[PDB]
Design an enzyme around this catalytic site. Structure first.
Site, PDB file in Angstrom:
ATOM      1  N   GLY A  18     -30.908  54.033 -47.242  1.00 48.24           N
ATOM      2  CA  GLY A  18     -29.940  53.099 -46.477  1.00 48.24           C
ATOM      3  C   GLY A  18     -28.708  54.044 -45.582  1.00 48.24           C
ATOM      4  N   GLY A  21     -28.884  56.836 -48.259  1.00 46.97           N
ATOM      5  CA  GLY A  21     -30.387  57.650 -49.194  1.00 46.97           C
ATOM      6  C   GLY A  21     -31.041  56.637 -49.083  1.00 46.97           C
ATOM      7  N   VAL A  22     -32.354  57.350 -50.554  1.00 44.82           N
ATOM      8  CA  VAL A  22     -33.181  56.252 -50.522  1.00 44.82           C
ATOM      9  C   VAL A  22     -32.688  55.031 -51.922  1.00 44.82           C
ATOM     10  CG1 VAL A  22     -34.538  58.015 -50.647  1.00 44.82           C
ATOM     11  CG2 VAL A  22     -33.548  57.896 -52.960  1.00 44.82           C
ATOM     12  N   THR A  81     -26.923  47.542 -59.009  1.00 45.62           N
ATOM     13  CA  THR A  81     -26.759  46.440 -58.159  1.00 45.62           C
ATOM     14  C   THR A  81     -27.803  44.930 -58.387  1.00 45.62           C
ATOM     15  OG1 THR A  81     -27.579  46.638 -55.729  1.00 45.62           O
ATOM     16  CG2 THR A  81     -25.424  47.917 -56.140  1.00 45.62           C
ATOM     17  N   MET A  84     -32.668  41.434 -54.660  1.00 47.10           N
ATOM     18  CA  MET A  84     -31.836  40.272 -54.287  1.00 47.10           C
ATOM     19  C   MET A  84     -34.107  40.149 -53.087  1.00 47.10           C
ATOM     20  SD  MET A  84     -29.126  38.743 -53.788  1.00 47.10           S
ATOM     21  CE  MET A  84     -28.928  37.668 -52.685  1.00 47.10           C
ATOM     22  N   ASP A 128     -17.276  46.787 -43.327  1.00 47.58           N
ATOM     23  CA  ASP A 128     -18.642  46.025 -42.552  1.00 47.58           C
ATOM     24  C   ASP A 128     -19.590  45.036 -43.148  1.00 47.58           C
ATOM     25  OD1 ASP A 128     -20.412  47.158 -40.539  1.00 47.58           O
ATOM     26  OD2 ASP A 128     -21.134  48.785 -41.814  1.00 47.58           O
ATOM     27  N   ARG A 132     -26.947  42.405 -41.182  1.00 45.71           N
ATOM     28  CA  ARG A 132     -27.710  43.004 -42.025  1.00 45.71           C
ATOM     29  C   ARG A 132     -27.448  43.692 -43.466  1.00 45.71           C
ATOM     30  NH1 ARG A 132     -24.584  45.208 -38.071  1.00 45.71           N
ATOM     31  NH2 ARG A 132     -22.666  46.404 -38.988  1.00 45.71           N
ATOM     32  N   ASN A 133     -25.730  43.626 -43.587  1.00 44.77           N
ATOM     33  CA  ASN A 133     -25.476  43.741 -44.919  1.00 44.77           C
ATOM     34  C   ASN A 133     -25.138  42.194 -46.278  1.00 44.77           C
ATOM     35  OD1 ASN A 133     -24.757  46.502 -44.500  1.00 44.77           O
ATOM     36  ND2 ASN A 133     -23.067  46.245 -43.480  1.00 44.77           N
ATOM     37  N   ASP A 146     -23.207  45.383 -50.225  1.00 45.27           N
ATOM     38  CA  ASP A 146     -22.449  47.252 -49.514  1.00 45.27           C
ATOM     39  C   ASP A 146     -20.871  47.301 -49.517  1.00 45.27           C
ATOM     40  OD1 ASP A 146     -24.749  48.398 -50.803  1.00 45.27           O
ATOM     41  OD2 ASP A 146     -25.009  47.329 -49.225  1.00 45.27           O
TER      42      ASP A 146
HETATM   43  C1  LIG Z   1     -29.920  45.669 -53.404  1.00 44.26           C
HETATM   44  N1  LIG Z   1     -31.068  45.383 -52.839  1.00 44.26           N
HETATM   45  C2  LIG Z   1     -30.051  46.541 -51.454  1.00 44.26           C
HETATM   46  C3  LIG Z   1     -31.301  46.882 -50.784  1.00 44.26           C
HETATM   47  C4  LIG Z   1     -31.218  47.506 -49.734  1.00 44.26           C
HETATM   48  C5  LIG Z   1     -32.000  48.695 -49.717  1.00 44.26           C
HETATM   49  C6  LIG Z   1     -32.346  50.138 -49.101  1.00 44.26           C
HETATM   50  C7  LIG Z   1     -31.288  50.329 -48.122  1.00 44.26           C
HETATM   51  C8  LIG Z   1     -29.500  49.569 -48.489  1.00 44.26           C
HETATM   52  N2  LIG Z   1     -28.480  49.907 -47.619  1.00 44.26           N
HETATM   53  C9  LIG Z   1     -28.292  49.335 -46.315  1.00 44.26           C
HETATM   54  C10 LIG Z   1     -26.989  48.753 -46.446  1.00 44.26           C
HETATM   55  C11 LIG Z   1     -25.930  50.176 -46.718  1.00 44.26           C
HETATM   56  C12 LIG Z   1     -27.099  50.699 -47.777  1.00 44.26           C
HETATM   57  S1  LIG Z   1     -25.608  51.473 -48.207  1.00 44.26           S
HETATM   58  C13 LIG Z   1     -23.905  51.724 -47.221  1.00 44.26           C
HETATM   59  C14 LIG Z   1     -24.821  50.377 -46.289  1.00 44.26           C
HETATM   60  C15 LIG Z   1     -23.663  49.716 -45.332  1.00 44.26           C
HETATM   61  C16 LIG Z   1     -22.511  50.646 -45.319  1.00 44.26           C
HETATM   62  C17 LIG Z   1     -22.671  51.607 -44.901  1.00 44.26           C
HETATM   63  C18 LIG Z   1     -20.918  49.635 -45.678  1.00 44.26           C
HETATM   64  C19 LIG Z   1     -22.697  51.616 -46.565  1.00 44.26           C
HETATM   65  C20 LIG Z   1     -28.105  50.088 -48.076  1.00 44.26           C
HETATM   66  O1  LIG Z   1     -27.794  50.833 -49.291  1.00 44.26           O
HETATM   67  C21 LIG Z   1     -30.170  48.181 -49.011  1.00 44.26           C
HETATM   68  C22 LIG Z   1     -28.520  47.289 -49.355  1.00 44.26           C
HETATM   69  O2  LIG Z   1     -27.647  47.566 -49.899  1.00 44.26           O
HETATM   70  C23 LIG Z   1     -32.175  45.815 -50.646  1.00 44.26           C
HETATM   71  C24 LIG Z   1     -32.644  44.862 -51.608  1.00 44.26           C
HETATM   72  N3  LIG Z   1     -34.024  44.023 -51.440  1.00 44.26           N
HETATM   73  C25 LIG Z   1     -34.794  43.924 -50.564  1.00 44.26           C
HETATM   74  C26 LIG Z   1     -35.463  43.275 -51.054  1.00 44.26           C
HETATM   75  C27 LIG Z   1     -37.698  44.032 -50.599  1.00 44.26           C
HETATM   76  N4  LIG Z   1     -37.493  43.940 -49.480  1.00 44.26           N
HETATM   77  C28 LIG Z   1     -36.620  44.792 -49.299  1.00 44.26           C
HETATM   78  N5  LIG Z   1     -35.417  45.258 -50.002  1.00 44.26           N
HETATM   79  C29 LIG Z   1     -31.920  44.532 -52.089  1.00 44.26           C
HETATM   80  O3  LIG Z   1     -31.659  43.433 -53.508  1.00 44.26           O
END
Ligand SMILES: Cn1cc(-c2cccc(N3CCc4c(sc5c4CC(C)(C)C5)C3=O)c2CO)cc(Nc2ccncn2)c1=O
Length: 265
Positions: A18, A21-22, A81, A84, A128, A132-133, A146
């Site tokens: 995201g 990062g990772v 966190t 989900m 935001d 997607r969020n 987020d």
């Molecule tokens: C809590 N969480 C986070 C993610 C997940 C995974 C990878 C990346 C991200 N993102 C994407 C969105 C995001 C971040 S930081 C940040 C944003 C928007 C912003 C500009 C304002 C600041 C991030 O960390 C996230 C979302 O926070 C995926 C989950 N779940 C699953 C389940 C199955 N497959 C993939 N993900 C999950 O449960």
């Protein structure tokens, strides 16, 4: 702020990358599912975030993806966190688009509106909000994720309103022109989110560039009524897009509107 012991975290799966990062899926103390953001160096205003993070953790609601705590006594820092299992709402909408009843769509809107009413009551801005969020759990409940983190992003393509990553398509006129964020700019975004939900995950203003979107919504262009949205539902999302911020509803009012439509059905 809750300082979590990284020794208590067990990494299990990569969840992708995201803005910071990772992100990994893991367990806390061998039992609780969590997501762990590993904050890439230079991606976040870390001192600023740490200095301000306790308010974010004290946000507690069933329809928020909870920020449990942080790991800051090392490099890189972690954000821990709620997890989900069904991932982000945008992908979820697209992958099950032939399976949703319209009552399920309205329920997703209710979920998000409850979260946003709670944030509003705490005078806390998401900044935001978009499909997607939002994330979806194993029982199909949608939660807002987020919230508040956009403020700490170090990435000029994201923080500039003419940057290629800025959420132009979810922004009201006063954000695009003046960077004036308020509860009412979250309201505007929520309307677009409702549109994303009822369109089963289509891109708002598809085929328009960001600058063309800004130009035309400033002149009054609005998203069309999705085929699956009733007039009552479209009236609700449309009310979020008043040109004047002070003419837009509160999330309390929106929630009441949504509950009324649910009852009628
Ligand atoms: C809590 N969480 C986070 C993610 C997940 C995974 C990878 C990346 C991200 N993102 C994407 C969105 C995001 C971040 S930081 C940040 C944003 C928007 C912003 C500009 C304002 C600041 C991030 O960390 C996230 C979302 O926070 C995926 C989950 N779940 C699953 C389940 C199955 N497959 C993939 N993900 C999950 O449960």
């Amino acid at each position: 702020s809750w300082e979590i012991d990284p020794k208590d975290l067990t990494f299990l799966k990569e969840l992708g990358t995201g803005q910071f990062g990772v992100v990994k899926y893991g367990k806390w103390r061998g039992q609780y599912d969590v997501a762990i953001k590993m904050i890439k160096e230079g991606s976040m205003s870390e001192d600023e975030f740490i200095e301000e993070a306790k308010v974010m953790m004290n946000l507690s609601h069933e329809k928020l993806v909870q920020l449990y705590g942080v790991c800051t006594k090392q490099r890189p820092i972690f954000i821990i966190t709620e997890y989900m299992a069904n991932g982000c709402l945008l992908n979820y909408l697209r992958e099950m688009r032939h399976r949703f009843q319209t009552q399920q769509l309205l329920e997703m809107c209710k979920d998000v509106c409850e979260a946003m009413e709670y944030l509003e009551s705490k005078q806390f801005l998401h900044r935001d909000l978009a499909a997607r969020n939002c994330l979806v759990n194993d029982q199909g409940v949608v939660k807002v994720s987020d919230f508040g983190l956009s403020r700490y992003v170090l990435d000029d393509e994201y923080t500039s309103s003419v940057g290629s990553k800025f959420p132009v398509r979810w922004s009201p006129p006063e954000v695009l022109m003046y960077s004036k964020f308020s509860s009412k700019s979250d309201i505007w975004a929520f309307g677009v989110l409702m549109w994303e939900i009822y369109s089963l995950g289509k891109m708002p203003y598809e085929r328009f560039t960001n600058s063309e979107t800004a130009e035309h919504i400033a002149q009054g262009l609005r998203l069309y009524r999705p085929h699956l949205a009733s007039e009552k539902v479209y009236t609700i999302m449309y009310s979020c897009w008043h040109e004047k911020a002070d003419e837009r509803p509160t999330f309390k009012i929106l929630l009441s509107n949504i509950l009324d439509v649910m009852d009628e059905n």
